Write a protein that binds this ligand. Structure first.
Ligand SMILES: [Zn+2]
Ligand SMILES: [Zn+2]
Lengths: 78, 1103, 65
DNA sequence: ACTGTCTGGACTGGTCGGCGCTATGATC
DNA sequence: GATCATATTGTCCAGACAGT
């Protein structure tokens, strides 16, 4: 499974903590267990034994939006 | 030792151009095609098996004889290009291929039978002009300065423009942003057939394979299994061994695990190709599709099918690495991945198609002869049986026709074009022209724009305007195109140098892959050492200069590329080692003395040809004084990066790029003594300058090119000044006395042809003055210039619609028709010459060349060499023109507003240089980056007694007073263009109309009208002019009256014999009304009725 | 193809002295001094004489009749 | 109810000039 | 020789459609 490591500096711009980030996928993804180890995000499988379903669920985490609105990319202030 | 001078490099470049020339690519490609291309095609076809039991005919050696022509009587005589042009004959030579019949497996006596006529390139090895001196070419009616390299088909010169295509059998990888996928494509070539094999990876991680004549992309794993590999492990290491690549492959075959055997994948392929078919039919269809479409360049036998899977694997890696960031996306416009199909390759493909059709025709002929006569007549004389079953013309009419209309087999079109004969520059530009297969209307931002690999290969400025911009380019002056060499020798040399074969050692991350012409051949431990050894051997003359070696050393992948194929545009560069160029003063002295040639310099490795792939590893120095220890090459001539017409511009670095492009484009439209044999030529249109002049400010390359011997313009004393507003908006003012003195005087020649064609039943045309009793008599005064043989006398003044050749035609289905050849209604002149000869069928042919004196007048287009163009605004008398204090009256006056707006400082520099050259008597060099400096020119102008700026004190020609401003007057080379107002004025009131739409005809030759397009109608609507629009579109173009039935709206029929109008669909002999409308609307109604649509016209009262 | 009779700017006759100028140029002398001694002082006439190239000899070889 | 895919259509106007093509394998 | 039936069947944008 994916062991996600994120840079803190980008987290300094999104304005939210890592643990709350976990709260954005615990309820949404009830088929997987999400754990936080400092600045590293580690997921745990409930019942996963095939590589086919890993590639059908790893991209759903990435496509999930933690905060904001869908379809929003860059943002600048003038 | 001195660091050399650009003059020595210019001498070396001049020697290079003297040894090779400017049409070397066409001549070399045609020589390669003649020497082995015909033999390669013949060996590829091999033999013909007709429907005869236990008998076959195999093909032997094929040769080509001298260019000869057989007349209608039957006399075979040597053929010359001038005779072919005059008599409308194709300059071709017979092809003799020996045929060896095989009876019961025993070879018989060979039979040498002509299989057709192949057109001969001018000044080629198979041409009669090869090796002839200037006097010999003069005695044959040929210009010694003519470069050749073109074909004469039906008396018209045809030039094959090179085609900038993708590299064959090379995989190019790119990413589609809209599709969010990584796509790799290869154009595999086999016997003139091109197959686009595609491997893609979508967002789901699966790999799809696109095969032609297949409607849907199928999975990569399915083709990989059907290609010969059975187990999953075979596909696993058929691609690579990198763990990421292995894991991607594991995911791929896990997703595609539903099919495990070859038969199921073949069944899927056949079902997708041909749905609703029996299983075995789909199986054989899929097998044939895989054999003849899936990478045909690897072969067609199933034995190499497994190897095709290997070629699939090298594709998958290329897809995978770009999908994982290991490698970057290669540039599609990079010239390392681009090849240049020359005339030789296209001729080989056309000859292959024609020979295949000839082979099938001969097979049908022998089958028919055996079925009719039987075995007794067939085998009693096998020499005569094979010869009589051959129709050579069937081949010939396929070749020359493709060289006539420009249409090539396989959908390629525009390959052969009419050679431009406007002047000396246009023909060279057309002979050094490269086109692209991309559509002209398509916006190709990444393809039309200039590329960094075009340095030394493609001219950066000389490009056409409009939709042809970017897609049509010209070869650079230093551009060199490779000639084919046997690849087996190169592969053997590479293997013996220390390259481990691919089948012996698997690729490794720590090993350098070796590629030969885009095909991986193995791996080596030290790629850099191998590249250095190959370069040293090439510099030592051990191997040919065609082989080019490059090394790509990235942090992830390492590769070595060796290229020895055709279509690679290269440039010569001086090898620099340890900061010292290999070219010394001794080599320059030997070149100047004639003891050393350019090929000698190439032999010792002092100067080497580099393509785009090798130059990636090179660090070139622009100037001989800028060489350092890290520099690897030295530029020979920085001014040689421009094309032949682009070098005509003096000081192109001082002008804007669009201005330089316009000047290069208009250099081909100028008028001058292009050819010394213009009077004997039979060109349909031509121009001659009475007093052509070589420019005083000319680049040194123009002397080597040959523009000085064949100038196309005159030097004009131009003063930049506003004169009564008649030079406004790019216009120019010319001197009346200068025009009357012969300045810019031109003559326009037009050639008309008349053939005494023979029809069926013995009917034929007759060359005689038509009798007034016959119909179609134009008039008594129209034949006043005809002789008793129906031919016009030379040196006879003619006008519009004047009869030149009196011809009478047999009547259709009565008296003989009139088909006399007449001058154009808007054209006139004096008959220059009359030529009487015969065509290929023995019929009489009369060509009349008529010349018209073109004195410059208002509307005549004159252009400078820096893109400054305009028409004559006023013919000002000399007494009214201003004059300087030195007593100089300008021959031209240009507006001062156009000079700074277009950023044209090169025109001012050229004016200063022309004045300096005229005052000193020494020609001023205007070569790019090595020309005479502007400040030096101003210095000598000051030393000559004139102002530094070139301004002179001028007096008004009318008032006689001194002008308050010093006017800038200098000598600028101004050329007259072929866009004269005499051939551009059109005026139609009423005349002929089209037989279909009852509308005015097209163009000016047939007295056509002027098109009032959709935009004109729109702006007339916007103006609110309803009646003006009615008068224009309806009352003046196709006004007509029809009869309409009020009961049903159908078009009523009017019978003149009965004298009554009635509706046939309905009856209604009373309620019929006349409606005025356009004939185009009636045609539209007829089209709708033909399309099973009924338009019912509901008539309404006008009030 | 042949030298113009008069200068295009002022009508000064130059065809008479062109062949002498061409002969002196082929002898290695400076064309400026040759023009100076021949009376060709204005640079327009010098333009006409210098920029002209003889080409009629290459046209006479192609007979037309 | 969304989402990627298959299918269909258009790609500024005008002008000058040229080149070239629009049958054939049986039958008496 | 002179005739004669036959002569094969490139991109981008928008609307409609199986699939989940
Ligand atoms: Zn009716
Ligand atoms: Zn003068």
């Amino acid at each position: 499974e994916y062991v996600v490591e994120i840079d803190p500096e980008r987290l300094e711009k999104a304005g939210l903590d890592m643990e709350k980030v976990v709260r954005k996928l615990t309820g949404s993804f009830k088929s997987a267990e999400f754990e936080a180890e400092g600045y590293t995000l580690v997921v745990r499988p409930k019942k996963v034994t095939k590589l086919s379903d890993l590639r059908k669920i790893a991209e759903k985490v990435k496509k999930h939006r933690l905060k904001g609105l869908s379809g929003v990319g860059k943002t600048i202030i003038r | 030792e001195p660091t050399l001078t650009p003059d020595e490099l210019w001498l070396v470049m001049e020697s290079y151009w003297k040894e090779k020339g400017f049409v070397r690519q066409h001549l070399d490609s045609y020589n390669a095609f003649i020497d082995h291309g015909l033999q390669d095609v013949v060996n590829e076809f091999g033999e013909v098996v007709p429907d005869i039991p236990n008998f076959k005919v195999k093909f032997g050696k094929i040769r080509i004889g001298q260019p000869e022509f057989q007349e209608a009587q039957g006399q075979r005589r040597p053929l010359y290009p001038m005779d072919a042009r005059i008599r409308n004959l194709t300059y071709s030579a017979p092809l003799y291929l020996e045929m060896i019949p095989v009876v019961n497996g025993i070879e018989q006596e060979p039979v040498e039978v002509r299989i057709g006529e192949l057109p001969i390139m001018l000044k080629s090895k198979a041409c009669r002009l090869y090796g002839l001196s200037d006097e010999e070419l003069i005695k044959l009616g040929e210009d010694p300065k003519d470069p050749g390299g073109y074909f004469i088909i039906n008396g018209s010169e045809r030039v094959i423009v090179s085609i900038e295509d993708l590299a064959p059998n090379k995989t190019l990888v790119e990413r589609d942003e809209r599709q969010n996928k990584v796509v790799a494509k290869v154009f595999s070539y086999r016997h003139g057939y091109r197959a686009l094999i595609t491997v893609e990876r979508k967002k789901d991680g699966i790999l799809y394979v696109t095969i032609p004549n297949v409607p849907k992309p199928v999975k990569f794993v399915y083709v990989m299994r059907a290609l010969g590999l059975l187990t999953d492990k075979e596909i696993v290491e058929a691609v690579s061994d990198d763990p990421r690549i292995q894991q991607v492959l594991f995911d791929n075959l896990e997703d595609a695990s539903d099919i495990s055997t070859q038969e199921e994948a073949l069944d899927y392929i056949g079902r997708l190709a041909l749905p609703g078919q029996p299983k075995e039919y789909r199986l054989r269809r899929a097998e044939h599709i895989i054999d003849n479409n899936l990478l045909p360049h690897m072969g067609v036998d199933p034995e190499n099918r497994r190897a095709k899977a290997y070629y699939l694997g090298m594709m998958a890696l290329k897809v995978l690495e770009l999908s994982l960031g290991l490698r970057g996306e290669d540039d599609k416009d990079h010239y390392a991945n681009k090849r240049l199909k020359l005339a030789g390759d296209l001729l080989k493909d056309l000859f292959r198609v024609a020979f295949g059709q000839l082979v099938k025709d001969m097979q049908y002929q022998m089958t028919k002869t055996y079925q009719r006569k039987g075995e007794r007549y067939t085998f009693e004389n096998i020499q005569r049986f094979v010869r009589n079953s051959i129709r050579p013309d069937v081949l010939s009419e396929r070749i020359e026709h493709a060289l006539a209309t420009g249409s090539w087999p396989g959908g390629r079109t525009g390959v052969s074009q009419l050679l431009d004969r406007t002047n000396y520059m246009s023909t060279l530009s057309h002979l050094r022209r490269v086109t692209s297969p991309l559509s002209r209307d398509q916006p190709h931002f990444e393809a039309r724009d200039l590329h960094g690999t075009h340095w030394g290969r493609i001219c950066p400025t000389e490009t056409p305007e409009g939709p042809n911009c970017g897609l049509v380019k010209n070869l650079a002056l230093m551009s060199q195109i490779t000639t084919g060499i046997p690849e087996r020798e190169v592969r053997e040399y590479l293997m013996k140098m220390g390259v481990v074969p691919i089948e012996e050692r698997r690729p490794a991350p720590g090993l350098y892959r070796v590629y030969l012409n885009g095909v991986l051949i193995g791996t080596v431990e030290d790629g850099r050492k191998l590249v250095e050894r190959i370069r040293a051997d090439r510099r030592a003359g051990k191997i040919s200069d065609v082989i080019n070696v490059a090394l790509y050393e990235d942090e992830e992948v390492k590769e070595v590329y060796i290229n020895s194929d055709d279509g690679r545009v290269r440039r010569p560069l001086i090898v620099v080692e340890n900061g010292k160029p290999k070219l010394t003063r001794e080599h320059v002295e030997g070149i100047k003395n004639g003891t050393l040639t350019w090929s000698d310099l190439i032999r010792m490795g002092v100067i080497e040809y580099l393509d785009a792939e090798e130059e990636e590893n090179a660090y070139v120095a622009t100037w001989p004084w800028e060489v350092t220890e890290e520099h690897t090459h030295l530029e020979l001539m920085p001014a040689a990066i421009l094309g032949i017409p682009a070098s005509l511009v003096p000081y192109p670095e001082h002008n804007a790029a669009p201005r330089n492009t316009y000047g290069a484009g208009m250099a081909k439209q100028s008028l001058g003594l292009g050819w010394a044999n213009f009077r004997i030529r039979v060109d349909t249109r031509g121009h001659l300058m009475h007093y052509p002049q070589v420019p005083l400010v000319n680049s040194r390359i123009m002397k080597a090119v040959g523009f000085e011997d064949r100038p196309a313009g005159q030097n004009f004393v131009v003063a930049v000044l506003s004169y009564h507003g008649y030079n406004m908006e790019d216009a120019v003012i010319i001197n009346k006395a200068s025009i009357e003195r012969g300045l810019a005087r031109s003559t326009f020649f037009r050639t008309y042809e008349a053939e005494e064609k023979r029809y069926l039943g013995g009917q034929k045309d007759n060359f005689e003055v038509p009798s007034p009793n016959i119909q179609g008599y134009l008039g008594e005064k129209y034949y006043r210039h005809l002789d008793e043989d129906g031919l016009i006398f030379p040196e006879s003044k003619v006008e519009g619609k004047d009869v030149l050749v009196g011809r009478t035609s047999p009547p259709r289905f009565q008296g003989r028709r009139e088909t006399s050849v007449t001058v154009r209604p808007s054209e006139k002149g004096v008959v220059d010459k009359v030529i009487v000869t015969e065509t290929g069928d023995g019929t009489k042919l009369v060509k009349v060349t008529v010349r018209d004196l073109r004195i410059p007048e208002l509307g005549d287009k004159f252009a400078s060499r820096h893109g400054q163009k305009g028409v004559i605004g006023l013919i000002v008398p000399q007494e009214d023109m201003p004059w300087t204090e030195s007593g100089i009256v300008p021959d031209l006056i240009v507006n001062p507003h156009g000079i700074p707006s277009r950023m044209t400082v090169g025109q001012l520099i050229e004016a200063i240089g022309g004045k300096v050259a005229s005052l000193t008597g020494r020609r001023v060099d205007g070569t790019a980056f090595i020309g005479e400096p502007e400040e030096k020119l101003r210095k000598e102008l000051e030393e000559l007694g004139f102002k530094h700026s070139g301004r002179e004190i001028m007096y008004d020609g009318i008032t006689g007073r001194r002008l308050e401003a010093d006017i800038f007057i200098g000598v600028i080379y101004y050329q007259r263009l072929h866009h004269m107002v005499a051939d551009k004025m059109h005026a139609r009131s009423r005349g002929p109309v089209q037989v279909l739409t009852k509308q005015p005809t097209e163009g000016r030759a047939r007295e056509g009208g002027l098109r009032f397009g959709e935009m004109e109608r729109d702006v007339l609507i916007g103006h609110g002019a309803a009646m003006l629009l009615i008068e224009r579109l309806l009352e003046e173009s196709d006004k007509t009256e029809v009869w309409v039935c009020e009961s049903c709206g159908h078009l009523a029929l009017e019978d003149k014999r009965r004298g009554k109008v009635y509706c046939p669909v309905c009856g209604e002999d009373e309620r019929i009304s006349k409606v005025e409308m356009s004939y185009a609307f009636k045609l539209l109604l007829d089209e709708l009725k033909a399309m099973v649509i009924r338009p019912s016209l509901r008539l309404k009262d006008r009030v | 193809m042949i030298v113009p009779v008069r200068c295009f700017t002022c009508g000064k006759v130059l065809a008479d002295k062109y062949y002498e100028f061409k002969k002196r140029v082929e002898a290695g002398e400076d064309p400026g001094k040759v023009l100076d001694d021949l009376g060709v002082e204005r640079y327009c006439c010098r333009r006409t004489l210098l920029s002209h190239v003889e080409l009629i000899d290459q046209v006479m070889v192609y007979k037309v009749y």
